[PDB]
Amino acid sequence: FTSFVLMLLFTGIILIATNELTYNRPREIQYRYLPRDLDSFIRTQEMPSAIFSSM
Amino acid sequence: AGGLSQLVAYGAQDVYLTGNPQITFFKTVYRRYTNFAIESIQQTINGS
């Protein structure tokens, strides 16, 4: 009787250790500097055309 | 009638002016600038 639940937990905890890898799901995006000429062009321009963007 | 009567009158010539807008006139973006202050200071004159 006791050995049954002991083996049940024995396999179940290995199953849990396998399961746990799925939890963390972060997004990866990198940052890079503008080209110098393009940066100067963007800084110089006076009107923005489209108003705003959130991404 | 009113300004809208002109606004809607899109024509062939506009392919060069308002098709695919790159700027607007109605929202200025101001650029932040280096912090500074300015003052008038008298310098010493050497000589008569």
Curated annotation (Swiss-Prot), chain B:
Intracellular or extracellular location(s): Virion
Post-translational modification: Myristoylated at the C-terminus. Glycosylated; highly branched oligosaccharides. The pattern of glycosylation sites are unusual.
Superkingdom in the source lineage: Viruses
Induction line: Expressed in the late phase of the viral replicative cycle.
Entry similarity comment: Belongs to the NCLDV major capsid protein family.
Miscellaneous comment: The viral capsid possesses up to five major capsid protein variants. They behave as asymmetric capsid components.
Known function: Major capsid protein self-assembles to form an icosahedral capsid with a pseudo T=169 symmetry, about 190 nm in diameter, and consisting of 1680 major capsid proteins trimers. The capsid consists in 5040 copies of the major capsid protein (hexamers), 60 copies of the penton protein (pentamers) and 1800 minor capsid proteins of different types. The minor capsid proteins form a hexagonal network below the outer capsid shell, stabilizing the capsid by binding neighboring capsomers together.
Protein's name according to its UniProt entry: Major capsid protein
Organism field: Paramecium bursaria Chlorella virus 1 (PBCV-1)
Lineage start: Viruses, Varidnaviria, Bamfordvirae, Nucleocytoviricota, Megaviricetes
